[PDB]
Structure 1
Amino acid sequence: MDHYLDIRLRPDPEFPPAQLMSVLFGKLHQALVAQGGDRIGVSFPDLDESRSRLGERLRIHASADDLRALLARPWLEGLRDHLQFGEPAVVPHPTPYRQVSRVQAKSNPERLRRRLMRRHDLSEEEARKRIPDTVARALDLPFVTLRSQSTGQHFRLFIRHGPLQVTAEEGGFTCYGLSKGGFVPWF
């Protein structure tokens, strides 16, 4: 993955950048289930780790033919009045690498309560005894607010950028563009 494509959000009087990033990440998710494979990675080159804001740029790391397939695919129809694209360009070197992973949390004890009553045939009070309210841990992470098409739920997909490295290791990517082990160049 030596090619990249940065997708910068235009400012808009109507919508905030977080919501447009959510819509762009959802459309990217549909485009990556539609394309298939595991060689498409994302990054957030304007990341503010202090305020946990994903920035206003989304970089797409892939091969050359995958980006030339993605740039002419109609997943950006309706989004083109809020974005601006560069070109599929080669990455510089030397460039540090970091992992962009989906981090989920157990922020709801009642769902774990339903799981333990389904898995051990317990009661409500026994499950509430084994699972207190202190296990609900929230993340200090930036995120996209997505909605599913298989089910109908709205979930926050928290994205964490890993520590910087000098080399990359082999592996694939999820259909959200995030990592199941693979690394993307950071610059």
Structure 2
Amino acid sequence: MAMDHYLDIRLRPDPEFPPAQLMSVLFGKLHQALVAQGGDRIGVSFPDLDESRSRLGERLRIHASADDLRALLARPWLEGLRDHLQFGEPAVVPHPTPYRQVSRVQAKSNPERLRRRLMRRHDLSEEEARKRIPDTVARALDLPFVTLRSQSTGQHFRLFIRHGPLQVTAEEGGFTCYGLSKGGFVPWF
């Protein structure tokens, strides 16, 4: 926990979008700025969620610095949510701070994924494909997120994600492109 980039921000109310109706736009306007724009000294955390309540977004919680995340207060790439949101700037963090566990990982729940794999790897079709394939091992990761409707359909798909524990020690460096800890202790202030 060497960085001291805590930038808090709040929400804004709008009538033309639900939580997914701006969460899919957040997934569209954060990943490309973290990919085509990029920056390993910039990301996000998830320190204010819950399991049963399904709290996905409740406040500004980012991880930046004096130069890498210093363009998070003069950025016209996030312009348009002035009817539904806002942002802040980084503040001086203290010595003893926490570090929450998160992950922006991909969970898979295919019970017929063995059949779609064997269609190009085994030739075992759907007729005899119920002998030893995983019928219920492909579980679902139920959690609250936005409903990103890709070309498969217009319905709101669930945003699977795994939380983590809380350790007093920290780990500075780099995480995945989504900000979830792929080896690095994520921030939770």
Give the Cα separation in 2 of the matches to 1:152 and 1:12: 22
Give the Cα separation in 1 of the matches to 2:20 and 2:183: 26
RMSD between aligned residues: 3.1
Give the Cα separation in 1 of the matches to 2:181 and 2:172: 11
Could you say what secondary structure the match of 2:48 adopts?
Answer: coil
Structure 2 CA distance for partners of 1:125 and 1:150, relative to 1, 3 Å: closer
Q: Is the 8 A contact 2:100 2:165 kept in 1?
A: yes
Q: Is the 8 A contact 2:12 2:85 kept in 1?
A: yes
**Residue 6 (structure 2) aligns with:** 4
Q: Is the 8 A contact 2:175 2:181 kept in 1?
A: yes
Residues 79-122 of structure 1 deviation map (CA, whole Å, 9 limit, x = unaligned): 23211212222333422212210243332323332013222232
- Percent identity reads 100
Q: Is the 8 A contact 1:43 1:184 kept in 2?
A: yes
**Residue 23 (structure 1) aligns with:** 25
Give the Cα separation in 2 of the matches to 1:39 and 1:127: 47
Give the Cα separation in 2 of the matches to 1:152 and 1:31: 24
Structure 2 CA distance for partners of 1:172 and 1:112, relative to 1, 3 Å: farther
Structure 2 CA distance for partners of 1:37 and 1:90, relative to 1, 3 Å: same
- Whichever structure has more strand as a proportion of its residues is 1
Could you say what secondary structure the match of 2:21 adopts?
Answer: helix
Give the Cα separation in 2 of the matches to 1:179 and 1:149: 28
Give the Cα separation in 1 of the matches to 2:37 and 2:152: 18
Give the Cα separation in 2 of the matches to 1:75 and 1:156: 26
Residues 24-44 of structure 1 deviation map (CA, whole Å, 9 limit, x = unaligned): 233111110022233323123
Structure 2 CA distance for partners of 1:89 and 1:127, relative to 1, 3 Å: farther
Could you say what secondary structure the match of 2:148 adopts?
Answer: strand
Give the Cα separation in 2 of the matches to 1:73 and 1:40: 14
Q: Which runs of 5+ in 2 are unaligned?
A: none
What is the count of residue pairs matched by the alignment? 187
Matched, 1:128 2:130: yes
Q: Is the 8 A contact 1:106 1:135 kept in 2?
A: no
The Cα of 1:132 is off from its aligned counterpart by: 4.6
**Residue range with higher mean Cα deviation, 59-68 or 46-55:** 46-55
Could you say what secondary structure the match of 2:35 adopts?
Answer: helix
**Residue range with higher mean Cα deviation, 1-10 or 154-163:** 154-163
- Whichever structure has more helix as a proportion of its residues is 1
**Residue range with higher mean Cα deviation, 26-35 or 143-152:** 143-152
Q: Is the 8 A contact 2:99 2:186 kept in 1?
A: yes
